[PDB]
Write a protein that holds these residues in place. Structure first.
Motif, PDB file in Angstrom:
ATOM      1  N   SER A  59       0.816  -1.208   0.000  1.00 52.02           N
ATOM      2  CA  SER A  59       0.000   0.000   0.000  1.00 52.02           C
ATOM      3  C   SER A  59       0.862   1.276   0.000  1.00 52.02           C
ATOM      4  CB  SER A  59      -0.955  -0.022   1.188  1.00 52.02           C
ATOM      5  OG  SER A  59      -1.772   1.135   1.167  1.00 52.02           O
ATOM      6  N   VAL A  60       1.861   1.367   0.910  1.00 52.75           N
ATOM      7  CA  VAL A  60       2.771   2.523   1.007  1.00 52.75           C
ATOM      8  C   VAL A  60       3.503   2.716  -0.326  1.00 52.75           C
ATOM      9  CG1 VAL A  60       4.846   3.432   2.175  1.00 52.75           C
ATOM     10  CG2 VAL A  60       3.003   2.366   3.519  1.00 52.75           C
ATOM     11  N   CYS A  61       4.050   1.624  -0.886  1.00 57.63           N
ATOM     12  CA  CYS A  61       4.798   1.706  -2.136  1.00 57.63           C
ATOM     13  C   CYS A  61       3.964   2.009  -3.358  1.00 57.63           C
ATOM     14  CB  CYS A  61       5.685   0.484  -2.320  1.00 57.63           C
ATOM     15  SG  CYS A  61       7.028   0.393  -1.106  1.00 57.63           S
ATOM     16  N   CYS A  93      11.029   0.213  -4.088  1.00 56.55           N
ATOM     17  CA  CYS A  93      10.420   0.649  -2.840  1.00 56.55           C
ATOM     18  C   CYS A  93      10.201  -0.542  -1.911  1.00 56.55           C
ATOM     19  CB  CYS A  93       9.119   1.393  -3.144  1.00 56.55           C
ATOM     20  SG  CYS A  93       8.211   1.969  -1.686  1.00 56.55           S
ATOM     21  N   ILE A  94       9.627  -1.640  -2.429  1.00 56.42           N
ATOM     22  CA  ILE A  94       9.361  -2.817  -1.593  1.00 56.42           C
ATOM     23  C   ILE A  94      10.680  -3.420  -1.097  1.00 56.42           C
ATOM     24  CG2 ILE A  94       8.487  -5.221  -1.642  1.00 56.42           C
ATOM     25  CD1 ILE A  94       6.200  -4.111  -3.420  1.00 56.42           C
ATOM     26  N   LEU A  95      11.651  -3.610  -1.996  1.00 55.14           N
ATOM     27  CA  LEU A  95      12.921  -4.208  -1.556  1.00 55.14           C
ATOM     28  C   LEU A  95      13.678  -3.361  -0.547  1.00 55.14           C
ATOM     29  CD1 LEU A  95      14.245  -5.772  -4.889  1.00 55.14           C
ATOM     30  CD2 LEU A  95      13.035  -6.970  -3.053  1.00 55.14           C
ATOM     31  N   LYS A  96      13.692  -2.035  -0.742  1.00 59.48           N
ATOM     32  CA  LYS A  96      14.359  -1.151   0.215  1.00 59.48           C
ATOM     33  C   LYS A  96      13.683  -1.176   1.565  1.00 59.48           C
ATOM     34  CE  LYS A  96      16.990   1.878  -2.740  1.00 59.48           C
ATOM     35  NZ  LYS A  96      17.210   3.245  -3.273  1.00 59.48           N
ATOM     36  N   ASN A  97      12.340  -1.173   1.573  1.00 63.18           N
ATOM     37  CA  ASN A  97      11.589  -1.188   2.825  1.00 63.18           C
ATOM     38  C   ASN A  97      11.766  -2.459   3.629  1.00 63.18           C
ATOM     39  OD1 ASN A  97      10.821   1.420   2.122  1.00 63.18           O
ATOM     40  ND2 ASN A  97       8.646   0.938   1.943  1.00 63.18           N
TER      41      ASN A  97
END
Ligand SMILES: C=CCc1ccc(O)c(OC)c1
Length: 119
Positions: free
Chosen positions: A15-17, A49-53
């Motif tokens: 959702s955030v990404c 975004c997902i991988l960094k988070n």
């Protein structure tokens, strides 16, 4: 981290990404199901975004084996985790955005983000 906690965490990051990148929900759903359009800009930004988070890519876009192990060890056997780590460590891309989508595509061969919802 439990499976139920990972399920919630994946939904939160998804959702955030999605909000951060502007990716269309259907395109995000394709990524979640393991169908990665590697060359698409929004798919690249969403994957990054997902991988960094999840601490899988560092500030310098280097793949972090410990980050992927922390997630994948809850989903697949130990020998498959080692195989995934070695396989996805071979991805070399000067474009860090393309590196991110290629990495999500690599991880997706083992388990998709969608697969966690059926666990
Ligand atoms: C490892 C964190 C994100 C992630 C990316 C791609 C995937 O296929 C995946 O499956 C569980 C998880």
């Amino acid at each position: 981290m439990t499976i139920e906690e990972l399920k919630t965490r994946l939904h939160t990051e998804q959702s955030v990404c999605k909000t951060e990148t502007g990716i269309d929900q259907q395109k995000a759903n394709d990524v979640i199901e393991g169908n990665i359009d590697v060359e698409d800009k929004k798919v690249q930004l969403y994957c990054e975004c997902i991988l960094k988070n999840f601490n899988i890519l560092d500030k310098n876009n280097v793949f972090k084996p410990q980050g992927i192990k922390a997630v994948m060890e809850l989903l697949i056997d130990e020998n498959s985790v080692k195989q995934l780590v070695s396989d996805c460590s071979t991805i070399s891309e000067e474009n860090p955005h393309l590196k991110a989508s290629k990495l999500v595509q690599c991880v997706s061969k083992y388990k998709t983000m969608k697969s966690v919802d059926f666990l």
